[PDB]
Design a protein around this ligand. Structure first.
Ligand SMILES: *[B]([O])([O])[C]([C][C][C][N]C([N])=[N])[N]C(=O)[C]1[C][C][C]N1C(=O)[C]([C]C1=[C][C]=[C][C]=[C]1)[N]C([C])=O
Lengths: 7, 249, 26
């Protein structure tokens, strides 16, 4: 969401 | 956390983030108790009344985190779960009695400056420390008010007398719970809030200088309301079940 | 084991900014 993508 | 402060780097190296894949999002807090085991609240995984029932395939654990939203490239470690264990007697029907669960990581995490396990209390420690007036500490990336922080938040709160706890709610309180917070006459405030569930309530033993997890963020009516208190799962009281599962698996 | 001793604190003999509050309550 507010979240930076996880590898 | 309400009326908390930004945590220092490496302040709670046991703090764990429960995170869902699709949609990518923050489910709850949790704690690292060993290289392969995480402790959280059962309601983070199962709560039928809200149609909540997560499986191991559904989540990811994020360890060594500080930033709520950022992928901490060289610092955090992400793990897949092998298996989930909810207390066979968790009461999601009534009062969240026995709100506890264990998660077994697919692979053990190596420790670091930012990742390190908290201790589980023994009978004597629990006995000396779990005293009304005594302050513990809660951490989480939860709501700032009953609003999302960029970094882990921390607050220190005193354990409240059982009678006070009981008299503050219409909810049936058990021996498996304890409440904490300031009273309206003490002028300080703070509490956990939604998003904080599953997070640790810790105390530092004055005997050996070690951090022990005494509680798990469980429930509360609103956040940081006067005359109300946050409720936590009484870890010691449930220690035999913890041990049981660890030995058994 | 080595539980409850933070690498950046207890291990280096440094105190966090509010831990004293806890200890003072005991
Ligand atoms: B958690 O999932 O992020 C959250 C923690 C909030 C803690 N609040 C404090 N310390 N002020 N837990 C919950 O939201 C739980 C889980 C479902 C219901 N719930 C509640 O806290 C309810 C009260 C309740 C207690 C026991 C059984 C059913 C309901 N509170 C509210 C405001 O809805």
């Amino acid at each position: 969401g507010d979240f930076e993508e996880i590898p | 956390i309400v009326e908390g402060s930004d945590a220092e780097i490496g302040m709670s190296p046991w703090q764990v983030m429960l995170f869902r894949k699709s949609p990518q999002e923050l489910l709850c807090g949790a704690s690292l108790i060993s290289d392969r085991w995480v402790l959280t609240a059962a309601h983070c995984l199962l709560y039928p009344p809200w149609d909540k029932n997560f499986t191991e395939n559904d989540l990811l654990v994020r360890i060594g985190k500080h930033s709520r939203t950022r992928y901490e490239r060289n610092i955090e470690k992400i793990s897949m779960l092998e298996k989930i264990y909810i207390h066979p007697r968790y009461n999601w029907r009534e009062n969240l009695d026995r709100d506890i669960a264990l998660m077994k990581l697919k692979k053990p995490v190596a420790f670091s400056d930012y990742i390190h396990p908290v201790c589980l209390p023994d009978r004597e420690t629990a006995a000396s420390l779990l005293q009304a007036g005594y302050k513990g500490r809660v951490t989480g990336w939860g709501n700032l008010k009953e609003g999302q922080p960029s970094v882990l938040q921390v607050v220190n709160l005193p354990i409240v007398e059982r009678p006070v706890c009981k008299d503050s709610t219409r909810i049936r309180i058990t021996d498996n719970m304890f409440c904490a917070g300031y009273k309206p006459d003490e002028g300080k405030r703070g509490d956990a809030c939604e998003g904080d569930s599953g997070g640790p309530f810790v105390m530092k033993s004055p005997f050996n200088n070690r951090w022990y997890q005494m509680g798990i963020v469980s429930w509360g009516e609103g956040c940081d309301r006067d005359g109300k208190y946050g409720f936590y799962t009484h870890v010691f009281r449930l220690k035999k079940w913890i041990q049981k599962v660890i030995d058994q698996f | 084991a080595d539980c409850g001793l933070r690498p950046l604190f207890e291990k280096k003999s440094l105190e966090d900014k509010t831990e004293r509050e806890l200890l003072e309550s005991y």
